Amino acid sequence: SYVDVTYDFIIKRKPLFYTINLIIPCVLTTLLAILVFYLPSDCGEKMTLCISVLLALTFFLLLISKIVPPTSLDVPLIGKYLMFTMVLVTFSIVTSVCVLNVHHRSPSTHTMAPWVKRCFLHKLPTFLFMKR
Amino acid sequence: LKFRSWTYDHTEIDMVLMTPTASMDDFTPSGEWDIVALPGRRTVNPQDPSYVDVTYDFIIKRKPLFYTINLIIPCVLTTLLAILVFYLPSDCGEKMTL
Amino acid sequence: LKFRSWTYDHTEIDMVLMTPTASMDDFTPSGEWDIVALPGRRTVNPQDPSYVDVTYDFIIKRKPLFYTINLIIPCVLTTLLAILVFYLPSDCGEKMTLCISVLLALTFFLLLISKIVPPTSLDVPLIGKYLMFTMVLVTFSIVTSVCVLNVHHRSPSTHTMAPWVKRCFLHKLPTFLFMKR
Amino acid sequence: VLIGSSMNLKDYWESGEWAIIKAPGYKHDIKYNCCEEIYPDITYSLYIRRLPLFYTINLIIPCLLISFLTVLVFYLPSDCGEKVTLCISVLLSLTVFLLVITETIPSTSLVIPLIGEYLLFTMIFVTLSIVITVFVLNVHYRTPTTHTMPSWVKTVFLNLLPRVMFMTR
Amino acid sequence: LFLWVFMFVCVLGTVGLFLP
Ligand code: NA
């Protein structure tokens, strides 16, 4: 006393809408994530770009968390990718502040230690092709 | 509001309006709108028989305070700052922000 | 709640309210609201027969801790940040950012409070009136901050200091406001 | 009379969001205050749990990740002009997350959530951080042609504290 | 000057609004 008949609609999706409207601005802001380090610290624009990229990534994360179903069975690759890039942008913010602090040190406040004398002027500039 | 009967027509029933207005003997004021007049009228076409119609007009006025406190004060407020970017100096770099 | 019949009237049925108050027997507590009294009355109009009515009044208090802890504290917070752009010196370049940001947060809380409130024009709540007052105050703060930032960047080559600002804003008021150079 | 002792979960279509732990059923014989006689009833009790991965990847990690930026202001030098932008940005972002969390939860005033308490806590301390950073920006941009330096600030903020904080000029 | 003026006006405004 158990029979049933099941049909299995297996459907493939045409991906051209969300590729143009969501994947391209995603990889656009991710391309802008690694870009705040080429900017010189003398111009006062090192924080605006970092905070703007982080807020745009949180905006796309809250945008992609709406068209997706709220199932905890699995997370999509876009959500994991935006979480990775958001952690990377937050680490970019803390190292950008920490490299902006060592720009404004003067002899009337601080004093250059001999290890940061001998390390960040001879070994690494010849290692990273700076050459003064 | 256009009241008419689907089954019959003017060759079979007339449709006479009794009182010219609609009664407000059970009306509760909504607190969002204001009725100001509720006339009714009878519509018939010469040179076109079999057409009765009774149409009631509701003429309403919006109580204009809720949208004034929310979409007019910021509208007249952020407009005043538009011609204010010219009195700011061009030495302190805060013109583009405003 | 107005209970009455549509078929019969007072000339054909009575309608006798038994107890003065509606009972509270199988009541589950709501968690958001509190029932404080439940009176009930029987309305008949003299010089108007064929009228019966039994109305029950529910007077309901709110348990207010949720909207307090989520809206009253950020309200007084962003209001407290509004008399604060004047202690910031104009030699730095961060005055207009703070002024525009305070006005943005105030308009945000006004558009948030206009959503949970009904759209009626009996009276605005005190939160909406308070935010409207503080918003007009922040706009006057923006225009006086631009006016006080223009006078900071005046050079001797392009301007001449008049004698009235000499006698007013240099001698009398720094002694009136306990400045003393 | 109950047939079994629990609700049947044999034909249960899975949910994907809530996992059922147990669902028992209990017979009671209760007496109401309207009526002088005893009425029986059967009460079932679903005991479910939320599977917490949609919210810990979209509401807890970004909230914690931006609440760990309210203390990072004080290592940024006042010679730059970005002490305020960072504070304003983290304040407004916590306000937007507060809007999201008051969109998701009910308005039950019995108890408060730990996450809403954490948001209120972080907003209070970041507002106290901006009212400190405006004071330190006023202390920094200050010249001897406009202000006289007191005597007690020469000993406290210049000799007593940098020996404690390990600065030593 | 405007700090003192707007502080006094804001205090009187809060009192006059939250009087009840
Ligand atoms: Na900015």
XYZ file of C-alpha atoms in Angstrom, chain D residues 7-118:
112
model
C 3.943 13.583 16.464
C 4.732 11.525 13.364
C 7.856 12.669 11.535
C 7.824 9.790 9.046
C 6.619 11.859 6.065
C 8.435 14.990 7.272
C 9.699 17.128 4.412
C 13.038 18.553 5.623
C 13.214 22.323 6.212
C 16.846 23.350 5.766
C 16.589 26.174 8.314
C 15.111 24.651 11.500
C 16.022 21.247 12.940
C 13.473 19.422 15.096
C 14.893 17.985 18.320
C 11.715 16.559 19.859
C 7.929 16.922 19.625
C 5.980 15.223 22.421
C 2.247 15.203 23.040
C 0.463 15.377 26.388
C -3.173 14.882 27.410
C -4.728 17.271 29.937
C -8.155 17.513 31.595
C -8.722 21.177 32.389
C -11.561 23.263 33.805
C -12.332 26.757 32.538
C -13.719 29.634 34.579
C -16.671 30.129 32.232
C -18.105 26.712 32.716
C -18.680 24.201 35.497
C -17.467 21.067 33.671
C -14.165 19.469 32.693
C -12.913 19.583 29.093
C -10.059 17.403 27.785
C -7.371 18.479 25.343
C -4.128 17.300 23.736
C -1.062 19.558 23.545
C 1.857 19.018 21.162
C 5.180 20.761 21.743
C 7.694 21.258 18.928
C 11.224 21.939 20.184
C 13.220 23.296 17.266
C 16.639 24.859 16.840
C 17.905 27.312 14.259
C 20.861 26.144 12.189
C 23.158 29.187 12.613
C 25.177 29.715 9.444
C 23.156 32.225 7.415
C 23.302 34.774 10.244
C 26.841 34.227 11.519
C 28.186 34.916 8.007
C 25.918 37.927 7.353
C 25.186 39.565 10.728
C 27.814 38.592 13.365
C 31.182 38.531 11.553
C 30.700 41.957 9.852
C 29.314 43.430 13.094
C 32.252 42.150 15.152
C 34.671 43.056 12.357
C 33.559 46.692 12.347
C 33.255 46.863 16.138
C 36.959 46.005 16.294
C 37.629 49.364 14.553
C 36.399 51.694 17.321
C 39.698 51.416 19.225
C 41.934 51.724 16.138
C 41.371 55.500 15.969
C 43.791 56.349 18.751
C 46.909 55.078 16.977
C 46.270 57.374 13.999
C 48.308 60.698 14.368
C 46.480 64.000 14.641
C 48.712 65.564 11.971
C 46.568 63.771 9.404
C 42.957 64.815 9.020
C 41.179 61.436 9.141
C 40.586 61.053 12.926
C 36.854 61.971 12.441
C 36.017 60.184 9.137
C 36.843 56.788 10.676
C 34.752 57.457 13.797
C 31.785 58.809 11.805
C 31.925 55.816 9.461
C 31.938 53.180 12.192
C 29.150 55.024 14.083
C 26.884 55.148 11.023
C 27.647 51.527 10.095
C 26.698 50.357 13.598
C 23.498 52.411 13.254
C 22.649 50.606 9.991
C 23.303 47.204 11.611
C 21.033 48.285 14.482
C 18.308 48.985 11.896
C 18.851 45.501 10.423
C 18.649 43.766 13.802
C 15.499 45.655 14.791
C 14.084 44.586 11.429
C 14.786 40.900 12.115
C 13.728 40.361 15.762
C 10.286 40.906 17.389
C 9.468 43.820 19.706
C 9.058 41.732 22.867
C 10.109 43.883 25.828
C 10.574 40.917 28.220
C 14.328 40.417 27.676
C 16.852 42.061 25.371
C 19.091 40.125 22.952
C 22.810 39.887 23.586
C 23.545 41.158 20.073
C 21.378 44.261 20.459
C 22.974 44.885 23.852
C 26.377 44.563 22.174
